[model samples]
Target chain A: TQAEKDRRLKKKHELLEEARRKGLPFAQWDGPTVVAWLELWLGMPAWYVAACRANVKSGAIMSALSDTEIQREIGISNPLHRLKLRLAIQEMVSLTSPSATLAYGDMNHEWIGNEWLPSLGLPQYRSYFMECLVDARMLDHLTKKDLRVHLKMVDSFHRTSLQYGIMCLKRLNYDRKELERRREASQHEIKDVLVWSNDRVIRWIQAIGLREYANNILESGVHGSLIALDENFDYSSLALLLQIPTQNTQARQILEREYNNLLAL
Target chain B: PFAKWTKEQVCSWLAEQGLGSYLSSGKHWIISGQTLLQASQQDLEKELGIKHSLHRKKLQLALQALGSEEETNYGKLDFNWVTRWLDDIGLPQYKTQFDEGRVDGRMLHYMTVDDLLSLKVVSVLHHLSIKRAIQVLRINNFEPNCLRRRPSDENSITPSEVQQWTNHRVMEWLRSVDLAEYAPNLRGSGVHGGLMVLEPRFNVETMAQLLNIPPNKTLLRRHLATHFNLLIGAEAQHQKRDAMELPDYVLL
Candidate 1:
């Protein structure tokens, strides 16, 4: 046991020394060495090593969050795998960096904390009528084969939109007035469409077996706000959720038929 | 449909339907659909040694549907929905076996949590996760009647002898019931070792106190008691019966 501990310490010291001698920032560090150091430090499996290496090969900084190209280059199709890989990489980066203040800072500070973190802490969001897995604690139970669609929503959910979404689902009076107030306030700020089109809203609706709410949103003009942000938004992925044809008028006809079939259920 | 099938295809279909291996191994069992249909259910047991009641029932259904237009849909060949659900839940490895275990999407309805264990899902974690997912669905009013109530106590203890009990035996049984995570705590507190030495005199309550487990954590004590009883209870019962059955012996 002593010898094994000694060996591990020796190896860790060697890695730290090598990293210091290179005098290069983490982004420019050699891919294999970066992976080897991370593997040793995190006790990551060989599969994770390959995954991290693929990200490095694509020239993405581990500290960076939500780089579409980098995410694509990582080439991990499985939702759970992507979440783990992302979390692991974020952890390693934070551990190695100076600004390692927040736990899971890569996602927490950069993404979800932007606007949603505040509202979710309130009593209203924690009510009996409300059912949501908005907690980061839930992230611990997620495994490699879990659906990415749900993870993406939780990862990106904003508090304002989530609260609004839940109130709409519950059809509460106070929440309806709040929604009307926000809609009036946000008309000049057209970019709030991005807030309205948040995947968390869509995922929250779908996750709770509220398919009808999702259908209503898509069928009515609200989903058009998502299309309005179509230059950068992902519609096909949403279409997959709707299980509708993803094209012109013919697609809508097929979607209508599918929706009818669902109504029969 | 009966006229078009071969022997291998018929037997392969039976195996895929989760019929026992004994049925698939026989050489001269019903070879054609027509022959299979002509043979009564009694003929199957006598000729092919198909002993399981459920398997016999499934085979009888397949046989009865031989000449019908819907014969191709026999044996409920696909369970894609179940497979997809398992895949989504991060238990994709159990997909094929779950299907083979005769658990279709419809069969998932009204199935208890214990049913997963019977369906050959060995992992307690998988069963618990599936049960939780079913609970979530029920809460959302989807498939409200799908899940049956789980039995609180079922074979909670395994049979063993008090004198033969060891640290390994106690821990192994605990692990079998998915309480292995608490093994470190038990080991750390020396409760298991204490149990090994105390034998029949030590009750679970004494061991629970030794471990500093409060009343809230009585399940652990109860579980230990169940196994403890399995060893001590049977021995006590046997000794009482012996006392009544036989005459007492003198020192001589």
Candidate 2:
């Protein structure tokens, strides 16, 4: 039974090893390599595979090659075969949680372009997201609601997968090499109001254009979720806490309004 | 106000509307102002004992006119406002339950399936209608203030002309394109028609998604693509026109 289990696993182990080695993050594949991809993985007929070998060699060249080149140049003239070949590339692109291949240090515009999107089987959207000139600093701001319209992402399934990928990115922040970063470095990430410390609360007050009231507001013992959780807190509560002049309606208005906006966030 | 009117007030109004003969015919079924407002053509025959065609038209016309005052940006979000809104959207049948439940604009904006069921909207069709309408309201940031009727323009709409259009004017273009279903979602979406003409990257696929055309309907999507290009037609010339325009001369 032990020998039988080893035999059963042998073929799958070999297949995975080959798939991984051929698909090394050494990045792009070459022409002959793509031909081998078509021949072995897609199982194209010998003649079409042979024809694909002629002239279309560079993976850079093949990446953008369309049905017209396949039909006219390679002589796989049938639309059905061309569609099969196209779908094969798309299937090849479908490929991981990617933490093994990536780190927070590797999360720049280039990483998003070549690695992150491709990891989510969404390499097609690389250019669109890149066009936004996205960086790690702005990455957390790309909410699902904003991404839909901003990136022109129409596919519902892709959006769901991308959303999950982003969630993983944020959550894995502390988990992923917190020994290195993801805390005071990722300072702007004020995800929850309740867990905020006194310094963090002061920073928040300064953030919402209330720097004058920052220290005053901090003295109220209402850091983090304290103000939000207060059942007794009214519209004017933040105003009074900051010692905002009640006579000056504009000052009170701004203080309470910023406080109002903070809790809603 | 109609809901607060007395029974005698309703009878006098009916007489004023020249449907006074119904008073004699249905004396036993004394109606009030609110009852008169809810009376559909069918209700006129069955409940009010008025089967005459012209008289029914006269009353319905009056009821319609009664609701159509100066069209303020937002009908004040109250019980009476709910009744008026329901009346406007042709869901007057649910006015009673909506009023009794005290469904205001705030309530209407956050309306869910349970809220609809509680309002006694048992009819699935009515449920969808109300839900879709409320969804539109939500997309428009619950600000029906812009529901003010904008008179649509003539068909000589060019790309540069469209670029200058207000956001609501862009919505008017949706009506022209027969994809008016999408017009509401565009309210806060910031799809400035300005970008439509100027951004070379703007194309049919993004426009189709914004229009809310169902993904299953490729044929419908293609139809919109056809219309979208037509609307964005002459954008090349529009661009060249901008490029060719003289800059404002200064005497400094």
Candidate 3:
């Protein structure tokens, strides 16, 4: 009924108004924003929402954050960080085609270059994104046989004008207003693509049960993983939430618990 | 030349093949494995002047240019190219003799922080951890992922036990990581004293401290030794005596 109510009230309609007013390309949130909105929408704890933010802010998501607020706060913004973004773009692009085969230990150059760089096209982002992998295991995960196959199925993405080649080469005759409009459209495209892919990632992860895989990846980084893997390198549901505590005993338990609690209302 | 020389003499002869260049200083060749690997990879193409694989031709040139004894500095080699070389050479297969047991000596030395950031390090760390875990078990006469007393018991380890062991190993790794490896001393010393010449220093007590072993080392060691290959301890101890030079802080 709430869905129906929200539909009638045009919750999405109001969102569109907000987007149009701000001149955002479309009425949607990026990965970080979506996670935050989910938390508030679901009435999850503040810390849980923060963890979601931190989780994406870390690993590939953190590195991929163009115009990242987190990096600015930490004073880590540099040419290298910018290159990291570019490189991620390149790697993502390479992942689109089945022919582009970067093995388990190989760098995702196409994703970083073609997909990520072309989309985000932040200058000097190669170094930053590369440095992110210093401890980040995203590339390693990608190179694995399973995840690599998954990535191949995933479509390519990039920063707006960078892919169009208008802004990256500084070929644009558009003024600030036009630039804003163009940027909004691209951001919407990028955000929608990411959201679609992340949902697919979650579904695939669910189908395969990457708890152990996630935990292992998380453990490798300074931060722990969102999923847990067992010793066999398979998804270990028990190992999920390495140290982070929650109210339930199963996977996606936190969200499940929230949904159950919300139903009582 | 091979028969006349004694073992030490043979080693010395190999050493004279400019093996010392691979060492951090003259004290020891930090990675005999990697150096021999570089030689092994290009021996057919570069040194022996035999070309078969087109993949190797480019590599031979790169190694030759980098390993030119006359050149003061060849400038920084492209890590991606070098990493590709490592992968092309099947570095993972040989990664068993060193730290965590993912990479053996036959791999490229991480020359810079940027090098550390590359996927190779993750490959080395992850592969080595599992491989070494397997090696320790196999050598001490156990199956891979053996459960206590029987194979069918999926409870190979209780939940609490897995947590404890994973935490212990992870902590040991953290303590042993010497973040400085990527900081200023990127090209300094390889962590010595393990199965391989350059291996992770998985000193359990130290790792416990690094990983913040909450309870105690006795419990942690017991958890590890319960399934740990005893011969692993023997090999590590032997390595300690032969290769571990006891860094300055240890004396204090």
Candidate 4:
């Protein structure tokens, strides 16, 4: 029996050597050994041993973060297993790669630059864009072109969030009668949604300076229409939508200058 | 709706309300009419170990009728609802991103930092905010990782925060977990690139793409994740235990 055990142990080391040649981190481990390691960390039961073996077959389980498509493809339905898998992936990525930081910047910037700002119609207004950048403290970091673009994207983002927050608040507070009224009038495009005067729009652009755009953004223009389309008559939450510090003086100055110019004209 | 019902009366009333199975178990005999009306769905489940969905639903309805609607709609939310939730919590811009990524209610049950990254949500600030929002919803069902230190320990360095680690340190950590042999492969095999490009949320398949590893190395990933989590959790526990014990000065 001892001789047989020694032979098996020798075979195990030989396999380890083979795995090393194939680029495995620790060739000493077999499927069960890997499973045992996860079990120690994840507390998965013995039933997962078979699945674990299958996962270990091609070395896909070396990082949990990268294995999602594989997991979905293989149809691992167990929630606990999926969670542990993700956690493992995160751990591996953290230790092994420093380049991961660069991987996402391009993706993030592309969205902010090309699509989101343009969609929200933020780039059309230079003053509104500048206010947003100053408030967000991005003026120092980003070049003018990037700052204006980033501000436009972030500003539009705040408006969308403000609309969603208001909708939620209405849902939470609306009684049965109010709910029915909204349902009945839901089909009609109310005039209040689109009628933004020049002053009203300026008020909005200025409010970005004071971080009050969410409440005011829905009061006029395309932002208003966007908010009104969602069934709620009114909306915005400063706490939930934007946590930018209040630059009330800057907003006040902008508002005063605009009004003075209007009076002179 | 019970005013002055006895324990037996309460049990019978519950059975009449389609909770007969609970009556048979007799584990819920201690439930008073006041308790039934006052307690939330979470309350009943946690305190009395209530299992039946029907029973929980009825209890929730009762609470709603009493004008005390609870915040138990975390998992039941649709994609649109989560979009609004993200907005209310102040990340409305991500609604489109989440929609594009197909982050639905069912997927929300297991949403983690890595899942967000898989969807191309690359900003660390956004990632932290989103994770915190999900945690508040209490729907993120996974066990917290070792990097999640106690709230008061602001100085705690999460694994994600250690980006500028030297190759020696990386190898040392790997060696700590008996995975030192792969150190050479780190530079040549794109393993270093994979780690560097690691998003807050990622899967094993993505890692394979990054590092040229096989799709079946899922076991190895699992082992490493578990190993790292255990080490981190152990360190956290060790620190806490040290803090709890009488100091050398106190003993002296």
What are the DockQ scores of the candidates, in order?
Answer: 0.01, 0.01, 0.01, 0.13
| Candidates ranked, most accurate by TM-score first | 1, 2, 3, 4
Report, in order, each candidate's fnat: 0.00, 0.00, 0.00, 0.33
Provide the TM-score for each candidate, comma-separated: 0.22, 0.20, 0.17, 0.17
lDDT of 2 by residue, A1-265 (tens): 6998677546544544564566542124544456666554454556777776653544444555577767666677544456555555543444311333232234545566565565444666788766554534345555565567666677664565455555555655514344124335535875555444446666776887778876764323444434545556555765666677767777666667776777777
lDDT of 3 by residue, A140-185 (tens): 2333332213222121222211223322213323232443344445
Which tens-of-lDDT digit does each residue in A6-117 have in candidate 4? Answer: 8865664565446535654433345544454444433344455455544453333444334464465445664334544555445434433434311112222233324323
Candidate 2, A264: how far from true, in Å? 88
DockQ of 1: 0.01
Highest lDDT scorer:
2
For model 1 chain B, where is the 10-residue window of minimal lDDT? Answer: B144-153
Report the lDDT tens digits of candidate 1 across residue range A1-265. 6999789767755765687566544554444456655555444456656755544421134545343423455555544444544565565554555552223222232123333332232222232111222323223444322313342333232222343433342332223335445545654433333234333344434644545546534322233233333333244444454555444455555444443343233
Binned by DockQ into CAPRI classes (incorrect, acceptable, medium, high), candidate 1 is incorrect
Compare candidates 1 and 2 on lDDT and give the better one. 2
lDDT of each: 0.45, 0.55, 0.32, 0.42
Tell me the deviation in Å of residue B121 in model 4. 24
lDDT of 4 by residue, B121-230 (tens): 67654564455445434523422321122233232246433222322344455555545444434331212211322322332343334334455554555556555444
Question: Lowest-lDDT window of 10 residues in candidate 3 chain B?
Answer: B185-194
- List each model's interface RMSD: 22.0, 16.4, 15.5, 6.4
lDDT of 1: 0.45
Candidate No. with top DockQ: 4
lDDT score, residue A152, model 4? 45
